[PDB]
Design a protein around this ligand. Sequence first.
Ligand code: NI
Length: 341
Amino acid sequence: TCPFYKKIPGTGFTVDAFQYGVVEGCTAYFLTHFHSDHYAGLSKHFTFPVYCSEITGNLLKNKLHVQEQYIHPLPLDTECIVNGVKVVLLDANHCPGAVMILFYLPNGTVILHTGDFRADPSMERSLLADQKVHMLYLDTTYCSPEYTFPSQQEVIRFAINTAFEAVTLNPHALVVCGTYSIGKEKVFLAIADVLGSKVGMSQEKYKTLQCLNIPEINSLITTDMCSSLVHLLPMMQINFKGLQSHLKKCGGKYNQILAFRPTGWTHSNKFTRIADVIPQTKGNISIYGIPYSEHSSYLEMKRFVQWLKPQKIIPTVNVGTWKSRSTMEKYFREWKLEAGY
Ligand code: NI
């Protein structure tokens, strides 16, 4: 049964609620983004209207085979009427195609559902600037002050400079980047661009990337692994055993691997600056864990909420324990006392 924090009151709508069967009272199912915890349950047999971005609808049709007649893609930044209710989709600064959803209820209440997001000051100049929001359904993934990480730009600078140095020292080094979902494409695209290479990958991952409307993509990725010196592998293979095995397969073209695992936060963030990050090394294999986040840090989240000044906050992440819920509620009250709303 569908939990309350996935239901939008005063509507027929649910958000990211495909794993509960037929939800009583639901006339339209919204999907914020194409990550498995959120789409869990969708398939070619789904027969209710799904509302989403264009990119998400490309993935639904080509990866999950949802039939076209049930996919309802909406443009961003554009007032649309769905089953009698005005909605807007906003860029969430998460993975490709990820949105936040503004719902203008018939009674005058305005609700923002962030989906998954990485808050940014650029959101203070979107269509949110123009009216009051009563209720916020908030991505609270990193809602505690221990969760710090650098800007995405600092992380990519570190990655590019690290890969360019290694490969210029040793033109026979291969670079490998881990992936297990969409998101974080800048990591492997920025490294391939500094090296003058396309990114090589499996047919299944190429297919996924071809749904993402990235400009000039045909110039940047390939299934011909032999032509590429940046390879994408499953995240599970980014370990010494898996990388040794891969290097065997390359037929003596290479004699070293430099590998990247884009994680979110890890506790090595509480001690070490990005500039000071070092790899784990075994022989001719080195593995860097880099803190590339597509969710808000604590400080980014706090800034957004103190700017928006909602009347009520409903967390959508870390909701399963009383300790998590009590921690989050204490920070919400702090923020509100500090800012004065
Ligand atoms: Ni996500």
